[PDB]
Amino acid sequence: LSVAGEIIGLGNVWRFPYLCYKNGGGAFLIPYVVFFICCGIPVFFLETALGQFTSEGGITCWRKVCPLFEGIGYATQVIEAHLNVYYIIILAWAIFYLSNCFTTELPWATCGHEWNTENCVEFQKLQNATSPVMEFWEHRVLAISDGIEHIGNLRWELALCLLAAWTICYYVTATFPYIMLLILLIRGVTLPGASEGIKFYLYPDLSRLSDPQVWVDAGTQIFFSYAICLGCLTANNNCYRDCIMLCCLNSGTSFVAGFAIFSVLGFMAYEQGVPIAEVAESGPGLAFIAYPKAVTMMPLSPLWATLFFMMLIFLGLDSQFVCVESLVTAVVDMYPKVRELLILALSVISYFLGLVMLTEGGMYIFQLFDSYAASGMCLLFVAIFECICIGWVYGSNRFYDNIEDMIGYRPPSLIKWCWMIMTPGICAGIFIFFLIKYKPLKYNNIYTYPAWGYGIGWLMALSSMLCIPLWICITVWKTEGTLPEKLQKLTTPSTDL
């Protein structure tokens, strides 16, 4: 087969290099492999198999079996609702950058502009060293207003572009991202003084394993393709495409993207005479600094500059479409009568709620949204329970019989063993590790949020996670009358099969 399909997504290009750079580089890899050998693959296989067997996606798949975990279907839905709001701000900045690439000379190549301070060394021929590209990102695209307390005015230029992003509602791109990634990687290796960039990326620092923050983000980063919309399958023909097509390439693509991006960071460190650890911004705008610089230092800069942001827009568009359309079926799941007015109203509310994180102080809010909602500990708690339902309540050996009927072959025994033992155990250990030694989140290792900022983040996490206990309380409340002897009927799966 070896069909291209769509694997690049957006986490590989943007999310992974941003997380790897902030955690020290090589020390980020050891959690990645540890949280991959059977903490990410068997869970993916489990959700795919459960979606295939019941042929239903959403909350009915977790309603047919283990009604204790019907709250997972509700908790998953809240995750997607949180994700859809803050995942469109990425498309906003890309549109703005694309609007400045249709000129003779890009604004970040040179200095001397009104959004540029007097300390702008051209850095192509040393206190207060500052590159023009970072100046363009920090003083023109979004101006951080020194703290979450300050909000300032509303960025009208980004306001229109965000509305342009939300206007789009309801081909040759099969290998277009891959070709551009390959040519960027070819250039990234080529520049002089890029050997130090790879050395920082590969060799790990073993002293960083003590910090709980390094474990939690990578373990949640590997979960970026799960617990949202992969539980709905409509294909059997599952075979073993669990990690032949949908997997084992996402990690490889992330590794290649990190190889390509980190090389350019070495060149900037070489030019500025500063260690690589403190040459760029350790925030979500990392992909908006390294890549534009690489496009700047290569022939035909505008032509290859307009294509990169275009491919980023294309990679965001399908993901946003999938999330918005999948959420609609959850709302219309009851289907009383149903005129696409639900879709029309969902876009307006989502757009009117995204303007909060678009002001001068709205960059900090995007950090709180990214670290806690649709990431952090939210999917760790859900991953603990989703393995428990199949592992113990329903039955792995009886589920293995179902997959032997469907696929035709019995899967290896190790899969179910670590399903039961290590997959929830690793997550529980990491959760307890985080709570034992709490590390408050600091922005760019510069700014520490006030107490109410962590309060808002923890409130988002609680609103994501507390669905299951409430649902089990309600379900136990709706009892026949035998309060001690009532788990029997609940634990029994649906007999409609």
Side-chain angles (χ1 to χ4, degrees):
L1 198 69
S2 75
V3 72
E6 207 153 10
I7 275 184
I8 185 75
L10 204 84
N12 293 354
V13 178
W14 167 81
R15 193 175 174 73
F16 174 59
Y18 144 65
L19 276 195
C20 186
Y21 175 70
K22 196 178 60 180
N23 292 123
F28 189 77
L29 261 71
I30 279 162
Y32 202 56
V33 51
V34 158
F35 223 110
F36 178 31
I37 214 56
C38 88
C39 314
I41 284 175
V43 152
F44 185 108
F45 170 58
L46 161 70
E47 286 239 333
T48 311
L50 196 56
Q52 173 55 236
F53 197 58
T54 38
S55 73
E56 286 162 54
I59 85 155
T60 64
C61 204
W62 310 98
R63 159 186 286 130
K64 299 315 178 61
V65 292
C66 62
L68 181 153
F69 309 80
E70 180 172 353
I72 286 178
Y74 294 162
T76 299
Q77 185 182 303
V78 178
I79 288 284
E80 201 167 359
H82 274 60
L83 176 86
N84 96 256
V85 180
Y86 96 116
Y87 207 39
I88 202 58
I89 315 290
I90 281 313
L91 274 89
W93 303 321
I95 286 286
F96 184 21
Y97 268 90
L98 182 65
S99 149
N100 304 277
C101 289
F102 268 117
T103 63
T104 298
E105 269 157 326
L106 311 174
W108 55 79
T110 74
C111 183
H113 293 327
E114 41 275 40
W115 56 113
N116 255 347
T117 199
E118 71 206 10
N119 307 332
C120 64
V121 196
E122 271 284 355
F123 286 139
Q124 83 254 20
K125 198 262 177 181
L126 206 72
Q127 62 178 120
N128 311 300
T130 300
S131 298
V133 176
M134 264 179 300
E135 297 255 70
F136 186 72
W137 159 257
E138 159 156 11
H139 284 39
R140 169 68 186 286
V141 187
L142 58 98
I144 39 185
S145 40
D146 174 352
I148 188 49
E149 167 190 359
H150 273 108
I151 306 295
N153 324 305
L154 174 82
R155 182 76 69 175
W156 260 119
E157 323 167 63
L158 266 68
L160 220 74
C161 91
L162 176 64
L163 186 67
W166 273 113
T167 307
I168 302 122
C169 54
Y170 97 81
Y171 215 122
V172 83
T173 69
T175 50
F176 172 53
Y178 299 157
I179 295 176
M180 271 276 268
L181 252 202
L182 161 73
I183 170 154
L184 256 295
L185 165 69
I186 288 179
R187 164 58 55 182
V189 152
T190 313
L191 320 92
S195 53
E196 306 173 59
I198 301 302
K199 194 184 313 302
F200 179 75
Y201 188 106
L202 286 195
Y203 166 62
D205 194 8
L206 275 312
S207 64
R208 180 44 81 229
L209 292 195
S210 152
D211 206 298
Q213 190 85 5
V214 153
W215 290 83
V216 299
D217 51 39
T220 323
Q221 207 274 350
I222 198 69
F223 275 170
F224 86 115
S225 293
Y226 150 91
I228 287 138
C229 67
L230 91 168
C232 49
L233 271 283
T234 40
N236 35 56
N237 69 79
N238 172 245
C239 287
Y240 261 120
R241 294 321 81 91
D242 156 43
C243 207
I244 286 303
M245 172 83 190
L246 302 193
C247 165
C248 293
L249 283 86
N250 195 298
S251 58
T253 299
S254 288
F255 195 60
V256 172
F259 230 72
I261 271 169
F262 258 80
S263 45
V264 180
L265 279 90
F267 176 67
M268 262 197 297
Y270 163 90
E271 201 72 9
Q272 293 184 182
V274 53
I276 315 172
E278 42 164 17
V279 86
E281 173 176 298
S282 100
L286 181 69
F288 294 125
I289 294 178
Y291 273 152
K293 178 67 181 183
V295 182
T296 321
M297 180 162 212
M298 71 165 268
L300 281 293
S301 45
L303 160 83
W304 300 100
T306 175
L307 295 190
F308 156 65
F309 295 115
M310 262 179 28
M311 142 207 83
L312 280 198
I313 284 290
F314 282 177
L315 300 188
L317 269 187
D318 49 347
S319 312
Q320 205 50 57
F321 270 135
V322 156
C323 294
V324 166
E325 291 304 327
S326 178
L327 205 149
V328 155
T329 89
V331 173
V332 82
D333 168 57
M334 290 335 142
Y335 207 92
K337 301 301 171 186
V338 177
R339 273 308 280 284
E340 62 189 18
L341 191 76
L342 308 192
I343 313 184
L344 183 48
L346 202 30
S347 309
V348 166
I349 297 298
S350 306
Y351 165 65
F352 270 52
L353 251 51
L355 250 64
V356 176
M357 52 205 58
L358 200 93
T359 40
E360 295 191 2
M363 157 55 176
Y364 293 97
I365 302 179
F366 182 75
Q367 189 81 297
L368 271 189
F369 221 123
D370 203 292
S371 299
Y372 283 64
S375 75
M377 311 85 78
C378 295
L379 318 86
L380 291 193
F381 196 68
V382 182
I384 290 179
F385 277 171
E386 262 170 356
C387 295
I388 279 187
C389 157
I390 294 332
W392 302 92
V393 187
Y394 178 48
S396 72
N397 312 8
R398 98 178 277 193
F399 187 55
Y400 266 49
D401 179 70
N402 308 353
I403 220 76
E404 190 247 1
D405 168 7
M406 215 43 90
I407 295 204
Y409 297 169
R410 160 141 295 192
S413 62
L414 176 77
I415 284 288
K416 84 182 91 153
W417 290 138
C418 86
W419 261 356
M420 320 187 201
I421 299 293
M422 336 205 68
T423 322
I426 288 295
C427 300
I430 286 191
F431 210 138
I432 294 317
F433 204 116
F434 184 11
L435 269 303
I436 282 175
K437 303 288 294 183
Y438 184 80
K439 296 306 176 184
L441 180 70
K442 36 185 57 57
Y443 173 68
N444 204 77
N445 185 347
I446 295 192
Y447 194 70
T448 65
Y449 288 79
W452 60 258
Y454 315 111
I456 276 185
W458 218 4
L459 195 81
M460 289 167 177
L462 288 189
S463 179
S464 178
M465 296 155 27
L466 214 70
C467 267
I468 300 158
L470 281 171
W471 184 241
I472 204 72
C473 188
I474 296 172
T475 319
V476 173
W477 180 295
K478 306 303 294 174
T479 174
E480 179 193 303
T482 59
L483 295 102
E485 286 283 70
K486 195 34 54 173
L487 198 81
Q488 298 281 351
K489 299 177 55 183
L490 268 307
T491 44
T492 41
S494 183
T495 312
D496 71 309
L497 294 110

